[PDB]
Amino acid sequence: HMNPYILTPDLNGEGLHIGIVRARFNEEIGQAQLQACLEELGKLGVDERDVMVVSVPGALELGVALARMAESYEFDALIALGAVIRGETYHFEVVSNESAAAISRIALETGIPVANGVLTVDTDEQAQARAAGKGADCAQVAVEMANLAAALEP
Amino acid sequence: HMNPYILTPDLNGEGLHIGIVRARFNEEIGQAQLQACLEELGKLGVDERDVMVVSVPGALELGVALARMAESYEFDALIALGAVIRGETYHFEVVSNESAAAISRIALETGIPVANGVLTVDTDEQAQARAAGKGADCAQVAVEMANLAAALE
Amino acid sequence: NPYILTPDLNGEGLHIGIVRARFNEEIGQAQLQACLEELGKLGVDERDVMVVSVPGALELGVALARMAESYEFDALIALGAVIRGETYHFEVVSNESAAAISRIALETGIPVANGVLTVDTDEQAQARAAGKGADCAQVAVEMANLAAALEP
Amino acid sequence: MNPYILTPDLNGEGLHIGIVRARFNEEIGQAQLQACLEELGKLGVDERDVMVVSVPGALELGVALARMAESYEFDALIALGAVIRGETYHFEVVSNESAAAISRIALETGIPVANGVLTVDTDEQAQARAAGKGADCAQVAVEMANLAAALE
Amino acid sequence: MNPYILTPDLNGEGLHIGIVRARFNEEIGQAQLQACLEELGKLGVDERDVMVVSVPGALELGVALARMAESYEFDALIALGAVIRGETYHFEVVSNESAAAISRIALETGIPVANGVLTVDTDEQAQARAAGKGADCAQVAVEMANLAAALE
Amino acid sequence: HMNPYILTPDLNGEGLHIGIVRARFNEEIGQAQLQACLEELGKLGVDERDVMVVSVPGALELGVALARMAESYEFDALIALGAVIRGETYHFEVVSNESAAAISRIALETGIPVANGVLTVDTDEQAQARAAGKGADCAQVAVEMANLAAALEP
Amino acid sequence: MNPYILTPDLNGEGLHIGIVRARFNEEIGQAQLQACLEELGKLGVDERDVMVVSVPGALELGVALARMAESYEFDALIALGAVIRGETYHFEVVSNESAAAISRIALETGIPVANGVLTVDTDEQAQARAAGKGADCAQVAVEMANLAAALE
Amino acid sequence: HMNPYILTPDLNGEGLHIGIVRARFNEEIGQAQLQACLEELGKLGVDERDVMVVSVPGALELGVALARMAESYEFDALIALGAVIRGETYHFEVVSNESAAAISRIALETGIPVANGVLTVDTDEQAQARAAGKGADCAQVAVEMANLAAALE
Amino acid sequence: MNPYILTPDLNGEGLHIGIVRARFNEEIGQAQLQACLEELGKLGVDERDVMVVSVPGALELGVALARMAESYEFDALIALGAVIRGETYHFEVVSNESAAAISRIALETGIPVANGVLTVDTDEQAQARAAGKGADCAQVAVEMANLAAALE
Amino acid sequence: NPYILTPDLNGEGLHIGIVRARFNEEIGQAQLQACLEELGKLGVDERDVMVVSVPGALELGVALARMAESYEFDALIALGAVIRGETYHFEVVSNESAAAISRIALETGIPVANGVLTVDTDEQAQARAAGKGADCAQVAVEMANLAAALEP
Ligand SMILES: Cc1nc2c(=O)[nH]c(=O)nc-2n(C[C@H](O)[C@H](O)[C@H](O)CO)c1C
Ligand SMILES: Cc1nc2c(=O)[nH]c(=O)nc-2n(C[C@H](O)[C@H](O)[C@H](O)CO)c1C
Ligand SMILES: Cc1nc2c(=O)[nH]c(=O)nc-2n(C[C@H](O)[C@H](O)[C@H](O)CO)c1C
Ligand SMILES: Cc1nc2c(=O)[nH]c(=O)nc-2n(C[C@H](O)[C@H](O)[C@H](O)CO)c1C
Ligand SMILES: Cc1nc2c(=O)[nH]c(=O)nc-2n(C[C@H](O)[C@H](O)[C@H](O)CO)c1C
Ligand SMILES: Cc1nc2c(=O)[nH]c(=O)nc-2n(C[C@H](O)[C@H](O)[C@H](O)CO)c1C
Ligand SMILES: Cc1nc2c(=O)[nH]c(=O)nc-2n(C[C@H](O)[C@H](O)[C@H](O)CO)c1C
Ligand SMILES: Cc1nc2c(=O)[nH]c(=O)nc-2n(C[C@H](O)[C@H](O)[C@H](O)CO)c1C
Ligand SMILES: Cc1nc2c(=O)[nH]c(=O)nc-2n(C[C@H](O)[C@H](O)[C@H](O)CO)c1C
Ligand SMILES: Cc1nc2c(=O)[nH]c(=O)nc-2n(C[C@H](O)[C@H](O)[C@H](O)CO)c1C
Ligand SMILES: [Cl-]
Ligand SMILES: [Cl-]
Ligand SMILES: [Cl-]
Ligand SMILES: [Cl-]
Ligand SMILES: [Cl-]
Ligand SMILES: [Cl-]
Ligand SMILES: [Cl-]
Ligand SMILES: [Cl-]
Ligand SMILES: [Cl-]
Ligand SMILES: [Cl-]
Ligand SMILES: [Cl-]
Ligand SMILES: [Cl-]
Ligand SMILES: [Cl-]
Ligand SMILES: [Cl-]
Ligand SMILES: [Cl-]
Ligand SMILES: [Cl-]
Ligand SMILES: [Cl-]
Ligand SMILES: [Cl-]
Ligand SMILES: [Cl-]
Ligand SMILES: [Cl-]
Ligand SMILES: [Cl-]
Ligand SMILES: [Cl-]
Ligand SMILES: [Cl-]
Ligand SMILES: [Cl-]
Ligand SMILES: [Cl-]
Ligand SMILES: [Cl-]
Ligand SMILES: [Cl-]
Ligand SMILES: [Cl-]
Ligand SMILES: [Cl-]
Ligand SMILES: [Cl-]
Ligand SMILES: [Cl-]
Ligand SMILES: [Cl-]
């Protein structure tokens, strides 16, 4: 059959510089995600002296923070952490839609991959069930995408 | 285990200049938000003469006002206040979605943080229960993101 | 304590452009009638108003773009009505027409009053037509003066 | 008030019209084009001034319409096609994205783009609207093309 | 009645195609890739002119596709993957955003991007569409690559 | 063509005895409905000495009241008035569904027509727009259905 | 593999049919009645054996149909009418309750009741279904009357 | 214009005997309702020894308990208390719909009014804001419908 | 704990089974019955102990099933058919009512009634489930019939 | 001040019947295991428990009806799980199974614990299975003693 050139994913974090932005709304979720995220990054070989962590009040403030960090081009990839948890109103949909749209835009316009670790759930229990796993996944996504972006960069 | 560099959030509002745009639809809600917002800003050290306040008819008119103020680059951070309360038709979704989108886009394209304090609720009672708290929250958001923006500049 | 810019409703000397979508034409006509009446109440000269019409709400965006780009108008107004039928097209037209109106205002600096109703029944549109038209005139006059206020 | 009113202009003589037809649910798009071409000729659009291109589906409309609008050889463009709901959320995705691309093209290039993409739940709904919609898009293109020149 | 009709061109000879496969629900993306590659070869695309990349999830498709489109080494791109509803609103977010990014890349770079990301409620739905959607994307990338060349 | 026997509607209220049950939740709506209902009944010829009016707190209490009145068989028809107005919760659907189901059941099981004048709306404005018209319609429905039930009774 | 199969019987000779027509959105119920009566006659139902009653709305169908079923003068009943969505949740209430009453009467009296009450969002939908549903109800009442007799 | 006979509602609770069934799911809510309900009943003249109170695990178990009490015909009226708070799944609709339906059917088939004081809300905060008020409302409903039932008997 | 466990019994020997097939979307109901009869014979149900009746639509199921259950000639009944969503709310009405009638019959007569009425959005969904569902209803009827006797 | 009947959890001497639906069998088995374990903790003798199984949630109603009608049980328990798939059948089975359980309890006076999960994902069912089974045992024991308390 057809056999094209397949770029193999690269999960080696050695030498990578990673920036993390953590929303503090429903802060216990952000904390659990960050803990699991750092643990995984170190497991992938990311030096702890090469990781910066910043926090913002809520998920709507992620975009402006991530935008500045990507503009500096000091980071091979960024990570957004936080949790939008549904309350009583339509504001759940507004914050979920807008935070994701900002994250997606930053990666597209600056070339810096941004892992989206922002949960958008109905209950505190759903956020707790996903916090630790989501943090670790974001660490793997940031390492893999930093390396893929480098591979596609001349 | 791992221990990276942590930027501790800074809420010192001394010397900041803040701009506020308040939509007047369901005016009582925006008024309660604005009173709480100014009261909180003073609590964080923002000078009275360091704050400008503007008002627009509705939430859809916010975007153009916030844009003009941010482009001047006279403000470290901005705040949008107001309330969209559902009526009988899909217009509630239209105004809620568009107002929020304009706020987010302004902060992204100018680098000036914009706290989104526009409620999007089904009933007047829900808006009442959230007005004062949200206005205070936006003051803390603008001061903190203003400091964070400069640190990253 | 702080600086407060007071709303300015003096429409004297303002140049206002209005774009009316003709779908469900009865609604747009009632809005335009109430809108022109209101503008004159604010002091807008009849000679300072240009009115154009387009087939539907999706055609509003391209029309308002050209008019705002000329910068011959201090503010614009969009009139019309999307009324739900049998299919999802209602959401599409409501979402997109609003997004275009919002985008033009942000990108050109010229305020655009959104007078496009997004309703389920003819009756809902009829109940809101005359009001919304007058509201748009007040929004355009206030936001037009407002825009000049923040400029040099 | 008798403000300056730009009367809509439906004279198609001398206009260059481009058409992009999505072929998913092909019967619908073909009925739309058959009615569209009939109407354009009725309004005076020369057969030699119309080009017709086709694409597999509604999501491919944006790239094709963008290239033709960028050539600035066309006074206005027309998008034909039909999204018909199936079993999954992809119906909302294709409906939203195709309309957003059409709108964005018209705002950014100044070339009006008639939106003749139906977004329906059933084959029957698409069949009821196809021929009427195609004719409607022809009238939207001629009117908006003449309108764009007036403001240019 | 008798205008210029551009005929679709499905000849894949000489074309260079880039493919990005989201690995979430990996079996689906892999089945799509098999049918896509087999169909590209059926259409005459040389295996030496196809590059394949993979990413963790559909939200990472944008940054990968954007980089490939920027290089301008490819006549068309293909996005493969599957969003499958779980328990939360994250399904809508990933469906909406991935589609919006794919659409945006094609419009702003001129490189057609076939959108083969499924957005379904069940695993069974994704499986039923996997192979058919992969081959459809092969035909879409070839046809639109040839169409883009025609309007250049 | 086919020409069957068509029973002509009869709107003569003379000699009819009508019972009304008014829910007081969002009381201004019930009041407007009752006023318009009485006016219309008198216009149809219903003697005011032949009409009884009772009220209950809310629409969920309509069923038990209407059930007793229908059981006495002192009434040729009954009328339910009131308004369920949506608030913040699913209780709007529960009260709307259940009040209508009770009204419908009473008519089916006792043979006494029950006009359903209970509005189920999203806003106070929608209830106000419909109060007076709905009250009058219920008066016409009770008169017509009392007469139709008599016609079908041997 | 080879069981007892009861064949449907559409012979309307000798049958007595009762019809209740809700008059809300009256044009719809009247169009249903015309097609229903014409189809009953086509099926052999004698006009002298059909009684027609009308009621204000679909919620009054239950009490009228219940009285007719109690008399046991009819081999089958037919309910005609149309619920058309307005602005509020009352559309669901009347759709649900009228259908539930019709269904309940047939189960507890043994008299089949054809349910020809439409529950639609637009006037156009009701019009498109009116005549077809009326005749369908004629065939349903005749066939089920004959089936009910078979199992007695 | 027209002037028919008007039965003025009567809220005299003297001599009434009331039965209450309280579901314990989200127990704090039912407790606040029950405290308000008993307090209101005394305000309307119901004797302490004239009230029986029973509790069941959840709202679905109400129906069987309310039925047994109503069939005894020892009570002039009954009250159902509790709260269904939405979680992650469709079970919220199932319990809300079925619990309410059982309450309505009991009042219809026995002639004993049953006040429905079972909240059906999305959040714990909504249940909290409504507990005390609803419990008081149910006391007034049971007393008034109890008097109305006897007047029509 | 080893409580008394009644083992499900699937021996169809000696059972009398009644079947009612709605004919709306007839291809579906016929595929359901073809699989159903195959399975019943597999479990040992004699061909001479099965009667098959048909009705126009799912709303007519309740009256027919009620009469057959009331005869007490059948150990269990089977309802076949398919409601396929169209353009309006009538899909929810027919789905809800048909299922409620089937359930009510089984509770009130003690005759188990297998519910093999599909409630789907598309023709394709009905075709995917028809044959499997028909076989499933055969096994439900035999097991529940034997189960009813054990508790009788 | 008033009379308060205290909940009684002493299960000694109670006779409990359990009906387990086998659809998504893993869930029902985990519920039954946790339920039997809990019942013994309350003092229910193993010899006083009968357990029966049915194919699906819709078959629960007829089974519980026969068991409650014998009055050999102080309370019953229904176990099982409805898990959403691709179609509306999820709502139908969830609504009807609950309605039957509620109706049996009201009409026979015997409490019935509703242990039927109505969830969207397998994971939601797995997270709730063991819990709900134990909860049902406490509900049946408490409500069984409760039912005797209100009787002579
Ligand atoms: C209801 C709400 N929920 C969340 C949430 O779940 N997660 C989150 O990060 N932020 C939430 N917010 C606040 C907005 O994200 C934002 O910080 C404010 O509107 C201030 O601009 C709000 C208002
Ligand atoms: C119906 C409506 N509702 C609100 C609302 O709830 N909150 C708000 O801030 N503004 C509302 N508006 C006004 C629109 O945002 C806008 O001002 C007009 O559509 C055009 O000026 C309108 C028109
Ligand atoms: C169905 C429809 N409805 C409306 C409406 O309710 N309000 C409105 O202003 N326009 C409507 N249109 C027309 C579209 O806006 C547009 O003109 C067509 O899609 C053709 O480009 C259409 C096609
Ligand atoms: C399922 C589907 N449905 C439609 C439709 O109803 N209308 C339409 O115009 N196109 C449809 N498509 C095709 C997509 O727009 C597109 O071609 C694919 O996602 C591949 O890029 C698809 C794939
Ligand atoms: C919940 C989820 N579901 C899917 C899915 O169904 N299909 C898919 O392709 N990707 C999914 N993702 C992953 C996001 O696209 C993304 O990788 C994460 O948010 C990490 O950035 C997530 C997070
Ligand atoms: C929210 C609510 N709304 C209404 C309403 O709009 N109309 C009405 O008549 N009653 C309402 N209720 C109360 C219930 O109908 C009922 O009276 C209580 O639950 C007491 O049993 C409630 C709880
Ligand atoms: C709003 C409404 N809509 C309809 C409809 O669309 N079709 C119909 O047949 N009946 C409707 N009704 C009337 C109710 O069935 C009923 O007559 C009133 O509630 C008076 O009892 C009402 C009230
Ligand atoms: C999830 C759940 N939620 C509630 C609730 O919000 N309110 C309530 O009163 N009961 C709840 N229940 C319990 C059920 O009503 C019932 O007790 C079980 O399904 C069977 O005993 C359950 C199981
Ligand atoms: C539109 C429609 N759809 C279906 C369907 O999808 N499945 C089905 O079994 N029956 C359908 N019916 C027929 C109705 O059940 C019924 O026969 C009519 O309302 C006339 O009584 C109708 C009328
Ligand atoms: C699709 C389906 N899903 C479930 C489910 O999730 N849980 C359950 O208990 N039963 C299910 N069933 C089976 C029905 O309850 C029933 O057995 C069939 O409709 C055959 O009568 C069916 C058919
Ligand atoms: Cl984007
Ligand atoms: Cl999980
Ligand atoms: Cl944005
Ligand atoms: Cl800007
Ligand atoms: Cl940017
Ligand atoms: Cl509301
Ligand atoms: Cl709150
Ligand atoms: Cl915008
Ligand atoms: Cl209004
Ligand atoms: Cl622009
Ligand atoms: Cl049409
Ligand atoms: Cl290559
Ligand atoms: Cl785009
Ligand atoms: Cl780009
Ligand atoms: Cl462009
Ligand atoms: Cl398929
Ligand atoms: Cl009923
Ligand atoms: Cl009205
Ligand atoms: Cl006769
Ligand atoms: Cl029924
Ligand atoms: Cl009856
Ligand atoms: Cl029966
Ligand atoms: Cl049709
Ligand atoms: Cl009831
Ligand atoms: Cl009872
Ligand atoms: Cl009764
Ligand atoms: Cl919630
Ligand atoms: Cl409240
Ligand atoms: Cl029973
Ligand atoms: Cl399947
Ligand atoms: Cl019940
Ligand atoms: Cl849980």
mmCIF file of C-alpha atoms in Angstrom, chain B residues 3-150:
data_model
loop_
_atom_site.group_PDB
_atom_site.id
_atom_site.type_symbol
_atom_site.label_atom_id
_atom_site.label_comp_id
_atom_site.label_asym_id
_atom_site.label_seq_id
_atom_site.Cartn_x
_atom_site.Cartn_y
_atom_site.Cartn_z
ATOM 1 C CA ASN B 3 9.908 23.334 42.006
ATOM 2 C CA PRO B 4 9.840 25.982 39.250
ATOM 3 C CA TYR B 5 9.708 29.774 39.416
ATOM 4 C CA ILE B 6 6.388 31.084 40.752
ATOM 5 C CA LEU B 7 5.296 34.653 40.095
ATOM 6 C CA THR B 8 3.266 35.451 43.197
ATOM 7 C CA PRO B 9 0.256 37.597 42.216
ATOM 8 C CA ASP B 10 0.628 41.261 43.184
ATOM 9 C CA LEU B 11 -2.445 43.307 44.132
ATOM 10 C CA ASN B 12 -0.709 46.614 44.919
ATOM 11 C CA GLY B 13 -2.830 49.185 43.101
ATOM 12 C CA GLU B 14 -0.667 52.176 43.996
ATOM 13 C CA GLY B 15 -0.082 54.372 40.958
ATOM 14 C CA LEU B 16 -2.419 52.534 38.587
ATOM 15 C CA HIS B 17 -4.874 54.362 36.324
ATOM 16 C CA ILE B 18 -8.082 52.449 35.599
ATOM 17 C CA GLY B 19 -10.766 53.032 32.976
ATOM 18 C CA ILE B 20 -14.315 51.735 33.423
ATOM 19 C CA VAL B 21 -17.148 51.429 30.899
ATOM 20 C CA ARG B 22 -20.589 50.717 32.358
ATOM 21 C CA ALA B 23 -23.580 49.727 30.250
ATOM 22 C CA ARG B 24 -26.813 51.223 31.574
ATOM 23 C CA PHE B 25 -29.337 48.597 30.421
ATOM 24 C CA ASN B 26 -30.950 47.282 33.602
ATOM 25 C CA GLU B 27 -29.261 50.314 35.067
ATOM 26 C CA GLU B 28 -29.637 49.487 38.768
ATOM 27 C CA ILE B 29 -27.398 46.438 38.288
ATOM 28 C CA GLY B 30 -24.545 48.377 36.700
ATOM 29 C CA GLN B 31 -24.838 51.060 39.370
ATOM 30 C CA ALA B 32 -24.448 48.536 42.194
ATOM 31 C CA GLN B 33 -21.479 47.016 40.367
ATOM 32 C CA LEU B 34 -19.848 50.414 39.831
ATOM 33 C CA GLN B 35 -20.240 51.449 43.472
ATOM 34 C CA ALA B 36 -18.654 48.184 44.612
ATOM 35 C CA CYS B 37 -15.916 48.477 41.985
ATOM 36 C CA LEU B 38 -14.815 51.989 42.947
ATOM 37 C CA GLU B 39 -14.986 51.113 46.646
ATOM 38 C CA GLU B 40 -12.720 48.102 46.093
ATOM 39 C CA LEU B 41 -10.278 50.053 43.917
ATOM 40 C CA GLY B 42 -9.743 52.539 46.733
ATOM 41 C CA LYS B 43 -9.216 49.624 49.106
ATOM 42 C CA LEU B 44 -6.370 48.467 46.840
ATOM 43 C CA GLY B 45 -4.805 51.935 46.606
ATOM 44 C CA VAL B 46 -6.118 53.381 43.336
ATOM 45 C CA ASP B 47 -6.323 57.167 43.575
ATOM 46 C CA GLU B 48 -9.674 58.826 42.923
ATOM 47 C CA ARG B 49 -8.102 61.126 40.313
ATOM 48 C CA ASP B 50 -6.548 58.044 38.652
ATOM 49 C CA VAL B 51 -9.921 56.601 37.534
ATOM 50 C CA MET B 52 -12.035 57.520 34.515
ATOM 51 C CA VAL B 53 -15.623 56.277 34.223
ATOM 52 C CA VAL B 54 -17.713 56.181 31.034
ATOM 53 C CA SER B 55 -21.207 54.828 30.381
ATOM 54 C CA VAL B 56 -22.876 53.458 27.252
ATOM 55 C CA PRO B 57 -26.496 52.486 26.520
ATOM 56 C CA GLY B 58 -26.120 48.704 26.348
ATOM 57 C CA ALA B 59 -23.661 45.837 26.336
ATOM 58 C CA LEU B 60 -23.277 45.791 22.546
ATOM 59 C CA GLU B 61 -22.029 49.391 22.673
ATOM 60 C CA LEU B 62 -19.288 48.433 25.128
ATOM 61 C CA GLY B 63 -16.853 47.140 22.532
ATOM 62 C CA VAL B 64 -16.412 50.399 20.648
ATOM 63 C CA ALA B 65 -15.942 52.363 23.885
ATOM 64 C CA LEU B 66 -13.462 49.932 25.453
ATOM 65 C CA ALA B 67 -11.489 49.926 22.196
ATOM 66 C CA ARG B 68 -11.095 53.705 21.978
ATOM 67 C CA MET B 69 -9.945 53.912 25.603
ATOM 68 C CA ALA B 70 -7.473 51.034 25.285
ATOM 69 C CA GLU B 71 -5.961 52.415 22.070
ATOM 70 C CA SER B 72 -5.081 55.667 23.848
ATOM 71 C CA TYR B 73 -2.834 53.579 26.135
ATOM 72 C CA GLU B 74 -3.555 55.934 29.027
ATOM 73 C CA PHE B 75 -4.865 53.037 31.159
ATOM 74 C CA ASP B 76 -3.049 50.130 32.785
ATOM 75 C CA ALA B 77 -6.261 48.067 32.781
ATOM 76 C CA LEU B 78 -9.955 48.413 31.961
ATOM 77 C CA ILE B 79 -13.226 47.131 33.426
ATOM 78 C CA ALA B 80 -16.551 46.426 31.705
ATOM 79 C CA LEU B 81 -19.720 46.487 33.814
ATOM 80 C CA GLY B 82 -23.329 45.713 32.998
ATOM 81 C CA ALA B 83 -25.956 43.007 32.931
ATOM 82 C CA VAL B 84 -27.755 41.065 30.211
ATOM 83 C CA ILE B 85 -31.036 39.699 31.618
ATOM 84 C CA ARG B 86 -33.005 37.230 29.522
ATOM 85 C CA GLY B 87 -36.334 38.322 28.082
ATOM 86 C CA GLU B 88 -38.511 36.418 25.622
ATOM 87 C CA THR B 89 -36.219 35.855 22.635
ATOM 88 C CA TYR B 90 -32.808 34.751 21.346
ATOM 89 C CA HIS B 91 -31.501 38.321 21.681
ATOM 90 C CA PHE B 92 -30.234 37.348 25.148
ATOM 91 C CA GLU B 93 -27.745 34.893 23.644
ATOM 92 C CA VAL B 94 -26.724 37.382 20.939
ATOM 93 C CA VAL B 95 -25.874 40.209 23.345
ATOM 94 C CA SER B 96 -24.217 37.901 25.886
ATOM 95 C CA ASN B 97 -22.009 36.192 23.306
ATOM 96 C CA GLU B 98 -21.022 39.315 21.372
ATOM 97 C CA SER B 99 -20.356 41.523 24.409
ATOM 98 C CA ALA B 100 -18.060 38.928 25.973
ATOM 99 C CA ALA B 101 -16.269 38.302 22.673
ATOM 100 C CA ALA B 102 -15.515 42.002 22.178
ATOM 101 C CA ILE B 103 -14.093 42.244 25.706
ATOM 102 C CA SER B 104 -11.795 39.261 25.175
ATOM 103 C CA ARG B 105 -10.615 40.443 21.758
ATOM 104 C CA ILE B 106 -9.723 43.917 23.053
ATOM 105 C CA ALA B 107 -7.517 42.490 25.798
ATOM 106 C CA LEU B 108 -5.805 40.194 23.282
ATOM 107 C CA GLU B 109 -5.087 42.761 20.562
ATOM 108 C CA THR B 110 -4.009 45.705 22.736
ATOM 109 C CA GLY B 111 -2.374 43.952 25.687
ATOM 110 C CA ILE B 112 -4.562 45.935 28.104
ATOM 111 C CA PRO B 113 -6.354 43.495 30.451
ATOM 112 C CA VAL B 114 -10.130 43.963 30.463
ATOM 113 C CA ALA B 115 -12.041 42.530 33.415
ATOM 114 C CA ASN B 116 -15.385 41.157 32.214
ATOM 115 C CA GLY B 117 -18.001 42.123 34.784
ATOM 116 C CA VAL B 118 -21.026 41.761 32.499
ATOM 117 C CA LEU B 119 -23.567 39.413 34.085
ATOM 118 C CA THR B 120 -25.557 37.091 31.802
ATOM 119 C CA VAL B 121 -28.523 35.842 33.853
ATOM 120 C CA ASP B 122 -32.097 34.641 33.391
ATOM 121 C CA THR B 123 -33.837 36.716 36.083
ATOM 122 C CA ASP B 124 -33.540 40.109 37.744
ATOM 123 C CA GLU B 125 -33.114 38.320 41.080
ATOM 124 C CA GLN B 126 -29.983 36.520 39.857
ATOM 125 C CA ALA B 127 -28.521 39.826 38.657
ATOM 126 C CA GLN B 128 -29.260 41.478 42.010
ATOM 127 C CA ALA B 129 -27.596 38.702 44.006
ATOM 128 C CA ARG B 130 -24.389 39.031 41.947
ATOM 129 C CA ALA B 131 -23.979 42.761 41.272
ATOM 130 C CA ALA B 132 -21.945 44.003 44.235
ATOM 131 C CA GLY B 133 -19.733 40.928 44.444
ATOM 132 C CA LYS B 134 -18.897 40.989 40.740
ATOM 133 C CA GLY B 135 -18.007 44.684 40.777
ATOM 134 C CA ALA B 136 -15.547 44.089 43.608
ATOM 135 C CA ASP B 137 -14.143 41.055 41.784
ATOM 136 C CA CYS B 138 -13.457 43.158 38.688
ATOM 137 C CA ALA B 139 -11.466 45.725 40.678
ATOM 138 C CA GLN B 140 -9.181 42.989 42.003
ATOM 139 C CA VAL B 141 -8.920 41.492 38.508
ATOM 140 C CA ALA B 142 -7.935 44.773 36.851
ATOM 141 C CA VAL B 143 -5.319 45.648 39.480
ATOM 142 C CA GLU B 144 -3.775 42.180 39.452
ATOM 143 C CA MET B 145 -3.704 41.768 35.673
ATOM 144 C CA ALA B 146 -2.360 45.308 35.301
ATOM 145 C CA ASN B 147 0.614 44.428 37.499
ATOM 146 C CA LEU B 148 1.043 41.080 35.744
ATOM 147 C CA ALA B 149 1.031 42.745 32.324
ATOM 148 C CA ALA B 150 3.817 45.155 33.282
#
